[PDB]
Each structure stands twice: as C-alpha cells, then as structure tokens.
Design a binder for this molecule. Sequence first.
Ligand SMILES: Cc1cnc(Nc2ccc(OCCN3CCCC3)cc2)nc1Nc1cccc(S(=O)(=O)NC(C)(C)C)c1
Length: 388
Amino acid sequence: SWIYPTVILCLFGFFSMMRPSEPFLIPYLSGPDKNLTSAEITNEIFPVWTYSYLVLLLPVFVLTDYVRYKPVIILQGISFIITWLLLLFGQGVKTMQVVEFFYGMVTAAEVAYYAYIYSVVSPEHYQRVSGYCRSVTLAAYTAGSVLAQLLVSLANMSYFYLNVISLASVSVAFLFSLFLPMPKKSMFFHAKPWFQDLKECYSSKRLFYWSLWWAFATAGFNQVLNYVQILWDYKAPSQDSSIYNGAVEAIATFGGAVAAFAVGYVKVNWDLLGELALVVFSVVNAGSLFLMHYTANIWACYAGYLIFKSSYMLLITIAVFQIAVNLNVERYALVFGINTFIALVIQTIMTVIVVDQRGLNLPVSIQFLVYGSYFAVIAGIFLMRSMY
Ligand SMILES: Cc1cnc(Nc2ccc(OCCN3CCCC3)cc2)nc1Nc1cccc(S(=O)(=O)NC(C)(C)C)c1
C-alpha cells in the first residue's frame, strides 16, 4: 500500500510550500507597515536566523528520529502559525528576530520532513515518491510566486493581505498536517533489529573533497539567498521604482527545475568532464556575482541571479549525484547531516566575521564583493585541481 500517506504528504507539500509573500518579504519589512531601515534588517535580524539553524540543528535532528516524524511536522505547522502571526503583528528589532528564530527552527524541521518519505513507504517506491514530493513542493512554490505576481503586479493587492494569504495557506497546511499517520517504526532509534563507527565512511580521498565542496557551496548559496533580496532593494527601491520580484523568483525556481531536469539526463562520457565543467561553471558563478555587484540596472541583477541560481542548482545536483553513488539508506541522511553541520559551521564563522553587527557591520554592497571573492577562491581551488 502506497496511496494514502503519499496523497496526504503531497497535499501538505503543496499547501505548505505555496507561500505567496516569499519574494515580496523584503519590501514588507522596510515598507510603510514596518518601520525598519535596510541596515537594521541586514546586519541585525537575519544572521540570528543562521544561529537558529546552527544551535537548533543537532537536537532537532535528535527530534527527527526519536519521536518518529509526526511531532516534528506538528511543530513545523505550529512554527508556521507563530511565524506568520508575528509577521502580521510584529514591529521592532526583537519580534522580527523571534520570527527568524522560529523560521530557523522551520528550516531545521524541513530536513526531518524530507526523511518521512523513506520511513512510511515500502522500498519499491522510494525514488519515485521522493521525486514526486520534491516536484510537488517546487511546483507549489512556483505557483505561489506566480499567484503573488498575478495579485500584486496586476491585480494591485497590498502586501499586508499577501501575508494574510500566506497565513491562511500555512493554516490550511497545519490542518492537513494534523491528519498524518504515525509510523510505528523509525530509521535509527526504534528500527527493526560515536566512538568506533564514524571512521569507515570518511576513510576516503574523493568523497571527502566532494562533501567539502558541497559544504562550502551550501554555505555560499545560503548567504547569497539570504541577502539577494536586500541587494534587489538596494539596486532599486521598493517605494521608488517598480520591482518585479515575484516573477523573477518564479522564473528562478523554474530554471532550477529545468537545470535539475537537464542534470537528470546527462549521457556524457565522464573521462575529462569531471575536471572540465566544474571550473567553467565556477567562473560562471564568479562572473554572475561580479555582474550583480558591478551593475546599476536592476534587470542585470535579476539576470545575474537567474544565471547564478541555475548554475548552482546544476552543480549541486551533480554534487548530490556524485556523493550518493555508493551510500546506503541511513548513511545517506547521516553523512548529509554531518556535511550540513560542517557547512553551517563555515557559514556561522563567515557570517560572524563579515555580516554580524558585533564585528565589521558591513553594508549589503561590500558583502557581495566578499562572496564573489569567496567563490573566486573556490574557482582557484578547482583550477589547481584541474592542473593536477
Ligand atoms: C518566511 C521567511 C522568514 N524568514 C526569512 N529569512 C530568511 C531569508 C533568506 C534565507 O536564505 C536561505 C533560504 N533557504 C535556502 C535553504 C534554506 C533556507 C533564509 C531566511 N525568510 C522567509 N522567506 C524566504 C525568503 C527567501 C527564501 C526562502 S526558501 O527557503 O523557502 N527558498 C526555497 C526553498 C523555495 C528555494 C524563504
């Protein structure tokens, strides 16, 4: 039997990721409804989110496999409700950091939400149902951004009612998430029958470098998707010029889907390709960051974000395909959790040095030059690897 938990899971993935006010969030924080300047959003509230995704990574992962995946989705729905009720009714540098704290706990519970597929479905339908759930979530976010563009850019709806629609969507998601079946078995703790268990997978000289590049690229993309909407707000003000953020992020998610669909059908020989395309797409990423930083037109910044997100989705799907060649079921999520923790340590150190208020207190313009130099160092490491 594989019908009804898949149906309820896909309906929650549809009505949970269908959130319209995600591209139009950074004008809502600095608009006439919330008196917040750009520096108070850039250097004070957002990096706390990263803190809430570091400190709440390891215990919530313990909450992933111990209570067997139902209370973590119930907590994710409650966190949806609290997050959007405090977005509609929170003003200040305290309540918005509470919003970012609960959204970091949302992002922590999302990883537990990915692992519900492999623990309620029979093993004849792992990859098919997992790809269907990922496609439903991505298409739900795409349709939500398209609906936001149709309601804001054409139908002329305010942002407050857009967050009201987002609250109604996550409330319907909570009502769908309460009706989930409890799995009696788990993956690690209550499964069917460290100090000396970690050395076996990490006794390599290839998978270590691929996981390290996965970690650096994940930290870089997390910071770029943190501050790319503030870059959009800086290159074009939300109250002065007409901004088209919903359509651009919809086309960006669609292009990431097209990039993943293109990676899923690569019948190209892997003799010289493993040391050829990585350097080229790294130069493309550095040039996209430099094109978004050295420009003044907002349209060039949208195009640079499109090219950068498509190239990152392509490279990261190649990375997930190459790391998960000789991995088991449990070791998949375990090694990805360890690599996610390493990526978050790197992101935390880089955010405290570059972005955080207790420190340099840098504006949003200099930070994109910093991350361009970051990906330039990554491209130089791939160039030195290609010379070998
Ligand atoms: C409702 C909300 C509350 N707080 C925030 N702050 C925030 C802004 C940008 C962030 O960048 C990281 C985005 N995702 C990338 C991987 C997990 C998190 C993380 C947090 N954003 C929010 N909306 C949001 C803004 C940008 C991206 C996203 S997303 O994570 O849902 N992007 C997709 C998963 C759809 C690709 C969501």
